[PDB]
């Protein structure tokens, strides 16, 4: 919750190193990439959108 010079430099360096290691394909981030996408959450949100759209369609 506190930000010092050490924390800032470490954060920036970590981001840079992660990006570069991803360029060389030296990292497997399936867990993060599927917790952010979360296809289950995608299906849930899609069904919620469909239900809301049907509700708006039938009120007329």
């Amino acid at each position: 919750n506190n930000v010092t010079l050490k924390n800032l430099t470490a954060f920036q360096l970590l981001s840079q190193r992660e990006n570069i290691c991803e360029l060389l394909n030296l990292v497997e981030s399936t867990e993060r990439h599927n917790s952010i996408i979360n296809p289950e959450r995608q299906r849930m949100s899609l069904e919620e959108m469909k239900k809301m759209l049907d509700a708006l369609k039938n009120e007329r």
């Binding site: 430099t9 470490a10 920036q12 360096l13 360029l23």
Partner: peptide, 27 residues
């Protein structure tokens, strides 16, 4: 970041190397 790297690889890579060296020196 990856789009900029795809546009100008040499400059971004030199920047990465210099910044990594400097941040390691700071840490």
């Amino acid at each position: 970041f990856f789009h900029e790297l795809s546009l100008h690889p040499r400059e971004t890579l030199t920047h990465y190397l210099w910044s990594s060296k400097q941040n390691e020196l700071v840490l």
